[PDB]
Amino acid sequence: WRVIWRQLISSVGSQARMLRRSMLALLLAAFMQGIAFACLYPIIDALLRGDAPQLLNWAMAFSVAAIVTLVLRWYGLGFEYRGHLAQATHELRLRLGEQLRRVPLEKLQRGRAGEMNALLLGSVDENLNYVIAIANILLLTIVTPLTASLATLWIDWRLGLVMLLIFPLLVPFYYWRRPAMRRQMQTLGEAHQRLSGDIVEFAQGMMVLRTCGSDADKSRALLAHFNALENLQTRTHRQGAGATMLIASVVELGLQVVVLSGIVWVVTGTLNLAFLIAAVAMIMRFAEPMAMFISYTSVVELIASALQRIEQFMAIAPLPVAEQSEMPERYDIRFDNVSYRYEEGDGHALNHVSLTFPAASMSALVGASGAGKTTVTKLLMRYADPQQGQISIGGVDIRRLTPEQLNSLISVVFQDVWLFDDTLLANIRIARPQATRQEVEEAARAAQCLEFISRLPQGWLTPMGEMGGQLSGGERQRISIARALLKNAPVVILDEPTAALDIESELAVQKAIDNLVHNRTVIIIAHRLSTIAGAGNILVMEEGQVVEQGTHAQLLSHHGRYQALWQA
Amino acid sequence: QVITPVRRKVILAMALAGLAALTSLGALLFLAWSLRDIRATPDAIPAWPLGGVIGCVVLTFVLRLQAFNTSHYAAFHLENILRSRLARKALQLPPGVLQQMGSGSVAKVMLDDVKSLHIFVADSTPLYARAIIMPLATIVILFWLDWRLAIATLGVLAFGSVVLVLARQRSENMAQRYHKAREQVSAAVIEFVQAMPVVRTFDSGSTSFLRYQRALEEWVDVLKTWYRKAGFSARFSFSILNPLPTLFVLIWSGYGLLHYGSFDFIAWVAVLLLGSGMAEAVMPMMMLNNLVAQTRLSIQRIYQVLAMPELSLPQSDQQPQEASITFEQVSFHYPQARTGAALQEVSFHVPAGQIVALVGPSGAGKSTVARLLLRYADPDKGHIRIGGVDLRDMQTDTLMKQLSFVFQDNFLFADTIANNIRLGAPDTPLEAVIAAARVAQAHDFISALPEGYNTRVGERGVFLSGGQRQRITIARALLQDRPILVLDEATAFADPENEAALIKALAAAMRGRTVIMVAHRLSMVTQADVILLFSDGQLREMGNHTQLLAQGGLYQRLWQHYQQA
């Protein structure tokens, strides 16, 4: 069975050899335990009638088998209780971190569920403790009665068939009942998921549901949904329990049926008395690892899903680069016939656009929606390749530049966010990490942030609280302006936060932007009359189709879409 | 012990599984009795003891099945009672302690804690009965069966626990330190995976990845030394719960008793079964202790959730009341963030029928008035006489009736026609519903959506929601009458169509209402009756827009700031 084993040996790392040595040690430990029960056959055969020489012979052979089994089980769990699992999950997390580094950014930027997924791997990678815990229990459950049963096939042959029949009717029949088992768990689960959807709808809009009026209709609807879930759970659980209790008592009914078959073959056939007592011992020995194995049959589902999610995530390939021998001295971003279809939620987010942003001062744009206005800025860092088109920067395609040169060429100024409330020297250092302190003091006063630096305590090495507590919208935006001012990127995308920042800090933010726009291309989307009229080459987009080029004057005197939106 | 839960059904299930374990011991003892009857005389098949064996097996299975059914019914009923009590507590929860504090925590608790309680009860009551009744009855039966070899099987069980407890002389000292290193790496992976979509627009990601790597390589040196502390103890406990040490003690006491006085053989095999049962009964004790610890954790979480809010002081008694909106001496702080005073003695009358657009500092002393109007919280010093009597006698249905909030985000459900229906009147007056969407000028984009007016928008329908959620909820506010309209922030959606269509929709919304348009721009401030200035919780000026402009105070300064951009 390769499709889980090659994943389990690829998603360990450089500890594959010690994992296979520990798997071999635990397989030999379970087989030698089966041989210890085979040595429990002639010990009972000898002790039925005394026989101190035969009892001493097979008791010292049982001492050898028990000591080899316990020492090999100790060496098998040595894989977990040395540092081999620590270094295994460590190398797996430092492979997944670099996979977070070179994943194309639209795959994690695409969905909130996608970012919550990629958030989860570094913390859900802790199940390898469970995958070394399951190995010993499943190996006991399948190997140990197989060795004892194939030992009975040439010690009296009539207990051998039934004891070889009990456990493949247990665990391979468990993995053949895994269709009906996951049917039971999914008949609970899908009802639990629609109830969880009603619960998260209730939990999000609880304020609107309280202050709206339907806290008698929708609330009692949720409560009747709770009662419906409880009745569905009991109505599934009755047949589930009637089927599942026999699965738990497989070893008990197998023990009593071997009792009856041994008794009828003692009084009808051979002298199988001592071998019957030792087989009665054997099956009650096999009782406990199946009693743990049915307690771990959810953890194997969780581990198989986690290994599928890892080896579905680590198969994500980066963006293709080709023949980087370019130095883009000119910054003339000309999208030509770009038609990028985004997802199943938004369709053709652009449709054959023609964009040119050649100015060393500014070239604004306004668009229709999330498709046509900001997904072109998403395309501008090649987050996704266009399904048809070309992205030039001066004269070179953007799929030719390496992401180091590309991500040092252009820089975005965000909405508000990402300082991590540390020393602000480090944040305007992760502007461009080869910066000295004097470069920070030169490029922080040009963003008009130095007065806020002197206003706060501790000087420049100060923590901003727990999330930027003394920093504000208008002060923490000047950090994101100081980052693009220190980085000195000759192309700046500028998501202007003016709609949130206007009445309190539009003076400081506009002064910082006017310091920023000098001698570099700036692409800005905003709604303020200074930014709507007095920008430069102003673009109008409807679902990713460009109209109303040029400045605001000729588009305004054209009396088209821009005059229509500006007149209100 | 615990009395207030469903104790009758779960104590019945616990005692029933305990009697099932006792009759399984009865089945094993009748098996040894039957083999005594067949070894002392090899004869025909023994009727009474083998009938007792098969009867005790089928009684043990039937009893354990009924214990399973009754324990799972107890778990289902306790899960239902807990979800009902959490829903009825969260329905009556003070909303400022709800959306600002634990927006996603309530669904997290109302899924995870109740699933933990179901799983704990249904999977932990037969474990309780087995691990406290099987190894305390096997000791009685073994002491009855043989005076020696119960001391020997207790010796091979207790040698492991003696060496295990004596191994704590080389002490651990690593619960709190390991737990804080675990919390530290689970913070510094979350910080990384949040910093990864952002820092890639900078340099390629090197400093955040180096911080994440050097926060991994400290937690590895905590985890590895924790393993090299717990290694001998856990490997020795996993080697002592193997049946082979118990088998070794039984066999080499079977040879050690052939010399110095032989115990009989069938008493030896009756020791051989029950001693291995008593030896295996240590592991489910550890499993139920593992479940009891984390269940006590989750029950402490459910009790802090159940004890944190108390009903927001509700009274539905007084009246609906006219002369709609005033304040009276309210100076309320913002809870759980600032221990100061987010208002300072705000006192104003408003005659019903006029528009009071108020402006202040960045929503820090401005939007908290709109939070305090809905009774999201109550003032530490003050009374809010909405009409005659204040919100201590609020008549909590009329707060749903009289006040029509419209906020800056306005979360929607997945039934878009009922997203404008299910605010104030759940029914189907669909001609009036499309008329209210017609006069609010949101009928066009909902007419253009694929699944009619009843479009399943969900959470993935970004095109179906769009930037017109304000137009949907304002049309919903035009559906019902609801005299007080409340705008927390309009025109924060800066789209050009939302620049155009929101103004006519609001002009269709301020008809016959005493609104409070808390707007961030000074757009509709010019067309409003009273313009309040705020500055760090203190109200500064009262009066109209042109009166505040003519007096030339700090409103002149703010309007001159706004005339720049």
Coordinates of N, CA and C in Angstrom, one line a residue, chain B residues 374-506:
Chain B
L374 N -28.2 52.0 21.3 CA -28.9 50.8 21.1 C -28.9 49.9 22.4
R375 N -28.4 50.5 23.5 CA -28.0 49.7 24.6 C -27.1 48.5 24.2
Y376 N -26.0 48.8 23.6 CA -24.9 47.8 23.6 C -24.2 47.7 24.9
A377 N -24.3 48.8 25.7 CA -23.9 48.8 27.1 C -24.7 49.8 27.8
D378 N -24.4 49.9 29.1 CA -25.1 50.9 29.9 C -24.1 51.9 30.5
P379 N -24.5 53.2 30.7 CA -23.5 54.1 31.3 C -23.3 53.9 32.7
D380 N -22.0 54.1 33.1 CA -21.6 54.0 34.5 C -22.1 55.2 35.3
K381 N -22.4 56.3 34.6 CA -23.0 57.5 35.3 C -23.8 58.2 34.2
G382 N -25.2 58.0 34.3 CA -26.0 58.7 33.3 C -27.3 57.9 33.0
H383 N -28.2 58.6 32.4 CA -29.5 58.1 32.0 C -29.8 58.5 30.6
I384 N -30.4 57.6 29.8 CA -30.6 57.9 28.4 C -32.1 57.9 28.1
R385 N -32.7 59.1 28.3 CA -34.1 59.2 28.3 C -34.6 59.3 26.8
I386 N -34.7 58.1 26.2 CA -35.2 58.0 24.9 C -36.8 58.1 25.0
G387 N -37.3 59.3 24.8 CA -38.6 59.6 25.1 C -38.7 60.1 26.6
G388 N -39.7 59.6 27.3 CA -39.8 60.0 28.7 C -38.9 59.3 29.6
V389 N -39.0 57.9 29.7 CA -38.3 57.1 30.6 C -37.0 56.5 29.9
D390 N -36.0 56.3 30.7 CA -34.7 55.9 30.1 C -34.6 54.5 29.7
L391 N -33.4 54.0 29.4 CA -33.3 52.6 28.9 C -33.1 51.6 30.1
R392 N -33.3 52.0 31.3 CA -33.4 51.0 32.4 C -34.8 50.4 32.4
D393 N -35.8 51.1 31.9 CA -37.1 50.6 31.7 C -37.5 50.5 30.2
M394 N -36.5 50.0 29.5 CA -36.4 50.2 28.0 C -37.5 49.6 27.2
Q395 N -38.3 48.7 27.7 CA -39.3 47.9 27.0 C -38.7 47.3 25.7
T396 N -37.8 46.3 26.0 CA -36.9 45.7 25.0 C -37.4 45.2 23.7
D397 N -38.7 45.0 23.6 CA -39.3 44.8 22.3 C -39.4 46.1 21.5
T398 N -39.7 47.3 22.2 CA -39.8 48.5 21.5 C -38.5 49.1 21.0
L399 N -37.4 48.7 21.6 CA -36.1 49.0 21.1 C -35.9 48.3 19.7
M400 N -36.5 47.2 19.5 CA -36.5 46.6 18.2 C -37.5 47.3 17.3
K401 N -38.6 47.7 17.9 CA -39.7 48.4 17.1 C -39.3 49.8 16.7
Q402 N -38.9 50.7 17.7 CA -38.7 52.1 17.4 C -37.4 52.4 16.7
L403 N -36.3 51.7 17.0 CA -35.0 52.1 16.5 C -34.7 51.2 15.3
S404 N -34.3 51.8 14.2 CA -33.9 51.1 13.0 C -32.4 51.4 12.8
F405 N -31.5 50.6 13.3 CA -30.1 50.8 13.0 C -29.7 50.5 11.6
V406 N -28.8 51.3 11.1 CA -28.1 50.9 9.8 C -26.6 51.3 10.1
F407 N -25.7 50.3 10.0 CA -24.3 50.4 10.4 C -23.5 50.4 9.1
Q408 N -22.1 50.5 9.4 CA -21.2 50.7 8.3 C -20.9 49.4 7.5
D409 N -21.2 48.2 8.1 CA -20.9 46.9 7.5 C -22.2 46.2 7.2
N410 N -23.1 45.9 8.2 CA -24.4 45.3 8.1 C -24.3 43.9 7.4
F411 N -23.8 43.0 8.2 CA -23.7 41.6 7.9 C -25.1 41.0 7.5
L412 N -25.1 40.2 6.4 CA -26.3 39.6 5.9 C -26.3 38.1 6.0
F413 N -27.5 37.5 5.8 CA -27.7 36.1 5.8 C -27.8 35.7 4.3
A414 N -28.1 34.4 4.1 CA -27.9 33.8 2.8 C -29.3 33.6 2.0
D415 N -30.2 34.6 2.3 CA -31.5 34.5 1.7 C -32.1 35.8 1.2
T416 N -31.3 36.5 0.3 CA -31.2 37.9 0.0 C -32.6 38.6 0.1
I417 N -33.7 38.0 -0.4 CA -35.0 38.7 -0.2 C -35.3 38.7 1.3
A418 N -35.0 37.7 2.0 CA -35.2 37.7 3.5 C -34.2 38.5 4.2
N419 N -33.1 38.9 3.5 CA -32.1 39.8 4.1 C -32.7 41.2 4.3
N420 N -33.7 41.5 3.5 CA -34.4 42.7 3.7 C -35.8 42.5 4.3
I421 N -36.2 41.2 4.4 CA -37.5 40.9 5.1 C -37.3 40.7 6.5
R422 N -36.3 39.8 6.9 CA -36.2 39.3 8.2 C -35.6 40.3 9.3
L423 N -35.6 41.6 9.0 CA -35.3 42.5 10.1 C -36.5 42.6 11.1
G424 N -37.6 43.2 10.6 CA -38.7 43.6 11.5 C -40.0 42.8 11.3
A425 N -40.2 42.2 10.2 CA -41.5 41.6 9.9 C -41.3 40.3 9.0
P426 N -41.1 39.1 9.6 CA -41.0 37.9 8.8 C -42.4 37.5 8.2
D427 N -42.5 37.8 6.9 CA -43.7 37.4 6.2 C -43.3 37.5 4.7
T428 N -44.4 37.5 3.8 CA -44.2 37.7 2.4 C -45.1 38.7 1.8
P429 N -44.9 40.0 2.1 CA -45.7 41.0 1.4 C -44.9 41.5 0.2
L430 N -44.7 40.6 -0.8 CA -43.6 40.8 -1.8 C -43.8 42.0 -2.7
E431 N -45.1 42.4 -2.9 CA -45.3 43.6 -3.7 C -44.8 44.8 -2.9
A432 N -45.1 44.9 -1.6 CA -44.6 45.9 -0.7 C -43.1 45.8 -0.5
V433 N -42.5 44.6 -0.6 CA -41.1 44.4 -0.4 C -40.4 45.0 -1.7
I434 N -40.8 44.6 -2.9 CA -40.2 45.2 -4.0 C -40.5 46.6 -4.2
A435 N -41.6 47.1 -3.6 CA -41.9 48.6 -3.6 C -40.9 49.3 -2.7
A436 N -40.5 48.7 -1.6 CA -39.6 49.3 -0.7 C -38.2 49.2 -1.3
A437 N -37.9 48.2 -2.0 CA -36.6 48.1 -2.7 C -36.6 49.1 -3.9
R438 N -37.8 49.4 -4.5 CA -37.9 50.3 -5.6 C -37.7 51.8 -5.1
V439 N -38.3 52.2 -4.0 CA -38.1 53.5 -3.6 C -36.7 53.8 -3.0
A440 N -36.0 52.7 -2.5 CA -34.7 52.8 -2.0 C -33.6 52.7 -3.1
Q441 N -34.0 52.4 -4.3 CA -33.1 52.4 -5.5 C -32.1 51.3 -5.4
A442 N -32.4 50.2 -4.7 CA -31.6 49.0 -4.7 C -32.3 47.9 -5.5
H443 N -33.4 48.1 -6.2 CA -34.1 47.1 -6.9 C -33.4 46.6 -8.1
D444 N -32.5 47.5 -8.7 CA -31.9 47.2 -10.0 C -30.8 46.1 -9.9
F445 N -29.9 46.2 -8.9 CA -28.8 45.2 -8.8 C -29.3 43.9 -8.3
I446 N -30.4 43.9 -7.5 CA -31.0 42.7 -7.0 C -31.9 42.1 -8.1
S447 N -32.4 42.9 -9.0 CA -33.1 42.4 -10.2 C -32.1 41.8 -11.2
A448 N -30.8 42.2 -11.2 CA -29.8 41.7 -12.1 C -29.2 40.4 -11.6
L449 N -29.4 40.0 -10.3 CA -28.7 38.9 -9.7 C -29.4 37.6 -10.2
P450 N -28.6 36.5 -10.4 CA -29.2 35.3 -11.1 C -30.3 34.6 -10.4
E451 N -30.2 34.3 -9.1 CA -31.3 33.5 -8.4 C -32.5 34.4 -8.0
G452 N -32.9 35.3 -8.9 CA -34.1 36.1 -8.6 C -33.8 37.1 -7.5
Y453 N -34.8 37.4 -6.7 CA -34.6 38.2 -5.5 C -34.2 37.4 -4.3
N454 N -34.4 36.1 -4.4 CA -34.0 35.2 -3.3 C -32.7 34.5 -3.5
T455 N -31.7 35.3 -3.8 CA -30.4 34.8 -4.2 C -29.6 34.3 -3.0
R456 N -29.2 33.0 -3.0 CA -28.3 32.5 -2.0 C -26.9 33.1 -2.1
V457 N -26.7 34.1 -1.3 CA -25.4 34.8 -1.4 C -24.4 34.1 -0.5
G458 N -24.7 33.6 0.6 CA -23.8 32.8 1.4 C -22.7 33.7 2.0
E459 N -21.4 33.1 1.9 CA -20.2 33.8 2.3 C -19.2 33.9 1.1
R460 N -19.4 33.1 0.1 CA -18.6 33.1 -1.1 C -19.1 34.0 -2.2
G461 N -20.4 34.4 -2.1 CA -21.0 35.3 -3.1 C -20.6 36.7 -3.0
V462 N -19.4 37.0 -3.5 CA -18.9 38.4 -3.4 C -19.6 39.2 -4.4
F463 N -19.8 38.7 -5.6 CA -20.6 39.4 -6.6 C -22.1 39.6 -6.2
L464 N -22.6 38.7 -5.5 CA -24.0 38.8 -5.0 C -24.2 39.8 -3.9
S465 N -23.2 39.9 -3.0 CA -23.3 40.9 -2.0 C -22.9 42.3 -2.5
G466 N -21.6 42.4 -2.9 CA -21.0 43.6 -3.4 C -20.9 44.7 -2.4
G467 N -20.8 45.9 -2.9 CA -20.8 47.1 -2.0 C -22.2 47.7 -1.7
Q468 N -23.2 47.0 -2.1 CA -24.6 47.5 -1.9 C -25.3 46.8 -0.7
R469 N -24.5 46.3 0.3 CA -25.1 45.8 1.5 C -25.8 46.9 2.3
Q470 N -25.2 48.1 2.2 CA -25.8 49.3 2.7 C -27.2 49.6 2.0
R471 N -27.2 49.4 0.7 CA -28.5 49.7 0.0 C -29.5 48.6 0.3
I472 N -29.1 47.4 0.6 CA -30.0 46.3 1.0 C -30.6 46.7 2.4
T473 N -29.7 46.9 3.4 CA -30.2 47.2 4.7 C -30.9 48.5 4.9
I474 N -30.6 49.5 4.0 CA -31.4 50.7 4.1 C -32.8 50.5 3.5
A475 N -32.9 49.7 2.4 CA -34.2 49.3 1.9 C -34.9 48.5 2.9
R476 N -34.3 47.7 3.7 CA -34.9 47.0 4.8 C -35.4 47.9 5.9
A477 N -34.6 49.0 6.1 CA -35.1 50.1 7.0 C -36.3 50.8 6.5
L478 N -36.4 50.9 5.1 CA -37.6 51.5 4.5 C -38.8 50.5 4.5
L479 N -38.5 49.2 4.6 CA -39.6 48.3 4.7 C -40.5 48.5 5.9
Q480 N -40.0 48.4 7.1 CA -40.7 48.7 8.3 C -40.6 50.2 8.5
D481 N -41.5 50.8 9.4 CA -41.5 52.2 9.7 C -40.3 52.6 10.6
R482 N -40.4 52.1 11.9 CA -39.4 52.2 12.9 C -38.8 53.6 13.0
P483 N -39.5 54.5 13.7 CA -39.2 56.0 13.6 C -37.8 56.5 13.8
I484 N -37.1 56.1 14.8 CA -35.7 56.4 15.0 C -34.9 55.6 14.0
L485 N -34.2 56.3 13.1 CA -33.2 55.6 12.2 C -31.9 56.0 12.8
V486 N -30.9 55.1 12.7 CA -29.6 55.3 13.2 C -28.6 54.9 12.2
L487 N -27.7 55.8 11.8 CA -26.7 55.6 10.8 C -25.3 55.7 11.6
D488 N -24.7 54.6 11.7 CA -23.4 54.6 12.4 C -22.3 55.2 11.5
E489 N -22.2 54.8 10.3 CA -21.4 55.4 9.3 C -21.9 55.1 7.9
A490 N -22.5 56.1 7.2 CA -22.9 55.9 5.8 C -21.7 56.4 5.0
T491 N -21.7 56.2 3.7 CA -20.7 56.7 2.7 C -19.2 56.4 3.1
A492 N -19.0 55.4 4.0 CA -17.7 54.9 4.2 C -17.4 53.9 3.1
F493 N -18.4 53.4 2.4 CA -18.2 52.7 1.1 C -17.9 53.7 0.0
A494 N -16.6 53.8 -0.4 CA -16.2 54.9 -1.3 C -16.3 54.5 -2.7
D495 N -17.2 53.7 -3.1 CA -17.3 53.3 -4.5 C -18.0 54.5 -5.3
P496 N -17.8 54.7 -6.6 CA -18.5 55.8 -7.3 C -20.0 55.7 -7.4
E497 N -20.4 54.4 -7.6 CA -21.9 54.2 -7.6 C -22.4 54.3 -6.2
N498 N -21.6 54.0 -5.2 CA -21.9 54.2 -3.8 C -21.7 55.6 -3.3
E499 N -20.9 56.4 -4.1 CA -21.0 57.8 -4.0 C -22.3 58.4 -4.5
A500 N -22.8 57.9 -5.6 CA -24.0 58.4 -6.2 C -25.3 57.9 -5.6
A501 N -25.4 56.6 -5.6 CA -26.7 56.0 -5.2 C -27.0 56.0 -3.7
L502 N -26.0 56.2 -2.9 CA -26.3 56.2 -1.4 C -27.0 57.5 -1.0
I503 N -26.7 58.6 -1.8 CA -27.2 59.9 -1.4 C -28.7 60.0 -1.6
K504 N -29.1 59.5 -2.8 CA -30.6 59.5 -3.1 C -31.3 58.4 -2.3
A505 N -30.6 57.3 -1.9 CA -31.2 56.3 -1.1 C -31.4 56.9 0.3
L506 N -30.5 57.7 0.8 CA -30.6 58.3 2.1 C -31.7 59.4 2.1

